[PDB]
Design a protein around this ligand. Structure first.
Ligand code: HEM
Ligand code: HEM
Ligand SMILES: Cc1cc(N)nc(C[C@H]2CNC[C@H]2OCCNCc2ccco2)c1
Ligand SMILES: Cc1cc(N)nc(C[C@H]2CNC[C@H]2OCCNCc2ccco2)c1
Ligand SMILES: C[C@H](O)[C@H](O)[C@H]1CNc2nc(N)[nH]c(=O)c2N1
Ligand SMILES: C[C@H](O)[C@H](O)[C@H]1CNc2nc(N)[nH]c(=O)c2N1
Ligand SMILES: [Zn+2]
Lengths: 411, 407
């Protein structure tokens, strides 16, 4: 079957056939659309089909489908599964699998870059100290003194689900949040519970507004351990505005490396529960979401105060005005310090080009409109006007429960 | 079967049960989400009538009463005999209000129970339709103090005698392609403008010419009518800070009035049912003015502001966007023409959602449409999970008449 999507700005119509290779479920039915829902131990029986499907994709991609090498690899994996109940990926397969999980990530606007991903194979890791060393190396490599390079580090796969590797941090680099007795929050309100966990584990908290959190690392199902990333490895950007000289005195900064560390990478039915990955920022992630969400740094009022905007009625659009100025500041600051960043106009235009190329060469590009459209200035970006089809392909990145909710404490 | 929605800003979780009363289909499957797609007999009619009358009698707390059983019988007899049926005034009013209540793409539904319903089921000609519509327009406008209204023309019969308003909205501006290759006025309306001309219209050929109504009664050929200009309330656009803003020569109309949809009530189809409310500022300032395929005014405005248009990262589009939208709101407010900003309308919609969850067990909502086209995440609806499903009575899209009609 064929499905069409239209761009309502250009009248360009694309035809999706790739959705036919979709296995996982969306959450939607013919009677309900769950498109705006945020969050909607394997046996041998379920594993060989998943392995076979993956290896068929891999071998097609290298133009060796049905070759002796393809057939021998199927037989070898087959035997490994029946005898050991799992299997190991070849290095080439791991790399392919990680690149494809990114390519298939329908909530990611940055996918034009998918084929340029440095993969660090950390499957020989055994301890939390080992994980710390791997993660420092990834941070240093990815940071590259401001010239950011995409990377992912992949720790050993799940076995019985009792021996999981996990990074407890939601991102490798984030700021602490501290709930005060008066109910106000110092730092990032998103990180309060995690900060509290770190403190209980023995972290000495400086208790400021931008304290970089320690890494909390779990190897082989053991209790997690704390490590401080060397500060010289944490690139940060002080935020200033090109025209407003008082902007610097708001005391804002942000880190340059966006690096998600709490997702699960599935490749050929194997589950990599610790697979931190990083790219570079789109400005709005910081300027809109991190700074201006009511439940995050919430700076809108203080900025608009300083700008002397009319704040007595929402219809003056003071919030919208202060919002644009903050986002100008973020982009100006990163550019001035030569730290890679992309604005939402550039990123969305590139995404449309990527999506069109994917339809031509791949037969489709699963995309989640709710996530792809930037959180300011939606309709003056081309993605707002682009119909998208959302479906799930593997290899993939998936959510998983927070480890403090499930971990069996050893003591 | 029972579904949760969470607001990620406030942690408020609501439980939806209303979706189980859902009739029509979404376009989505377990394999594919089509959430961002814009447009995805006697035997058939009785279940539809019964479903509707049950909910009606339930609403007036008379479910299972003799009057309920008697009406279901009377409608059954009428369908068996005539192949259709007629709604009581009370049913028509209830049905229209509920089609609005059920409109998953509408942010303004807190207002759904204050809808003036004009019953135009006795209309027979296009001049009649014109009269009804002028009366609707004048009532709704109310000298700037806008009141929500719908006018309901006769229902479909055999489908060869359709009433239709060919216009997409009652009030829109003409669009003309130039020898130049550019577009004068609204590029969205070029095809409709040519159809008007093809049928005789005296196109003044300007940037903001109120289109004529093109009205089809009883399946006949449509006829042209100019709405009396004193009935079309328009607003000149100026900025509270920028004295140069007026020189762009921008104006818009005060009355948003969709006229091309189909109202379905109890299986009956009302193919001409123009309805109107009042604007949310972004519809004009973001969409009408700034879409590239619309008036597309960002470049001109940015130039007048003397912003750096060399690089996208100066956010010159975003700066101008905000100013254009401040101007729209300021102008309407200054001329006392009802308008709502996107902060206010979305805050109201959240309150409405909570009311609907509490009093009805849910509220179908299409996040893609509900979140405003600017400043998305600084409005509360951005952080609100929404379930989208189709309830009846409903408003539905229908084919443009010029493709269907035979002359
Ligand atoms: C190279 C520069 C990149 C840019 C500008 C970018 C952009 C983004 C943005 C803006 C989001 C939404 C984030 C949010 O709102 O929470 C996102 C999501 C995501 N991206 Fe990227 N991305 C990049 C690289 C990467 C890389 C290297 C990977 C993995 C190898 C990746 C995989 C993902 C995934 C799985 C999501 C969904 C996250 C979630 O559900 O929370 N992206 N991307
Ligand atoms: C009273 C003030 C109202 C406000 C502020 C409002 C707000 C809106 C907005 C912003 C849209 C999106 C339109 C677009 O982006 O193209 C919309 C759509 C819609 N509204 Fe309302 N609305 C109001 C009254 C009404 C009334 C009176 C009705 C019917 C009785 C109605 C039914 C609908 C329907 C069916 C849609 C979807 C239209 C489509 O799919 O193109 N609304 N509403
Ligand atoms: C690799 C990468 C690159 C990039 N530009 N942005 C990201 C996303 C990071 C940087 N900004 C927000 C954060 O995402 C956090 C995870 N997504 C939100 C979420 C929270 C719960 C479920 O989904 C990741
Ligand atoms: C009753 C009403 C009130 C209001 N504030 N806004 C509207 C919507 C009007 C005023 N601005 C856009 C237009 O709707 C056009 C129809 N929707 C867009 C569309 C185009 C094709 C399919 O769907 C209607
Ligand atoms: C409820 C809603 O799905 C939720 O707030 C989503 C909307 N779109 C988003 N889009 C991006 N890129 N990131 C997000 O966190 C969200 N949040
Ligand atoms: C393709 C996409 O669905 C399309 O651009 C939609 C997005 N959201 C919208 N939202 C509203 N309110 N009105 C619209 O016309 C649209 N257009
Ligand atoms: Zn869906």
């Amino acid at each position: 079957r064929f499905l069409k999507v239209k761009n309502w700005e250009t009248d360009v119509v694309l035809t999706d056939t790739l959705h036919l290779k979709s296995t996982l479920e969306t959450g939607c039915t013919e009677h309900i659309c769950m498109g705006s829902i945020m969050l909607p131990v394997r046996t041998k029986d379920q594993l060989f089909p998943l392995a076979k499907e993956f290896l068929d994709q891999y071998y097609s991609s290298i133009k060796r489908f049905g070759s002796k090498a393809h057939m021998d690899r199927l037989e070898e994996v087959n035997k490994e599964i029946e005898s050991t109940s799992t299997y190991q990926l070849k290095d080439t397969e791991l790399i392919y699998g990680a690149k494809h999980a990114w390519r298939n990530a329908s909530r990611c606007v940055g996918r034009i870059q998918w084929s340029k991903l440095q993969v660090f194979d950390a499957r020989d890791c055994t301890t939390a100290h080992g994980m710390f060393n791997y993660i420092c190396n990834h941070v240093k490599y990815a940071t590259n003194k401001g010239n950011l390079r995409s990377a992912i580090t992949i720790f050993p796969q799940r076995t019985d689900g009792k021996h999981d590797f996990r990074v407890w941090n939601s991102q490798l680099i984030r700021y602490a949040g501290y709930k005060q007795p008066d109910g106000s929050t110092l730092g990032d309100p998103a990180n309060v519970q995690f900060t509290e966990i770190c403190i209980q584990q023995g972290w000495k908290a400086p208790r400021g507004r931008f304290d970089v959190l320690p890494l909390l690392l779990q190897a082989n199902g053991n209790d997690p351990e704390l490590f401080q990333i060397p500060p010289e490895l944490v690139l940060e950007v002080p935020i200033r505005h090109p025209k407003f000289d008082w902007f610097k005195d708001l005391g804002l900064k942000w880190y340059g490396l966006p690096a998600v560390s709490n997702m699960l990478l599935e490749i050929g039915g194997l589950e990599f529960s610790a697979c931190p990955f990083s790219g570079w920022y789109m400005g709005t992630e910081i300027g809109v979401r991190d700074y201006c969400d009511n439940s995050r740094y919430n700076i809108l009022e203080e900025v608009a105060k300083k700008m002397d905007l009319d704040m007595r009625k929402t219809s003056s659009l003071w919030k919208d005005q202060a919002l644009v100025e903050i986002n100008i500041a973020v982009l100006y600051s990163f550019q001035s310090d030569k730290v890679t960043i992309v604005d939402h106009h550039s990123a969305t235009e590139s995404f449309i080009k990527h999506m069109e190329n994917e339809y031509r060469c791949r037969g489709g590009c699963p995309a989640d409109w709710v996530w792809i459209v930037p959180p300011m200035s939606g309709s003056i970006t081309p993605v707002f006007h682009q119909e998208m089809l959302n479906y799930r392909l593997t290899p993939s990145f998936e959510y998983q429960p927070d480890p403090w909710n499930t971990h069996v404490w050893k003591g």
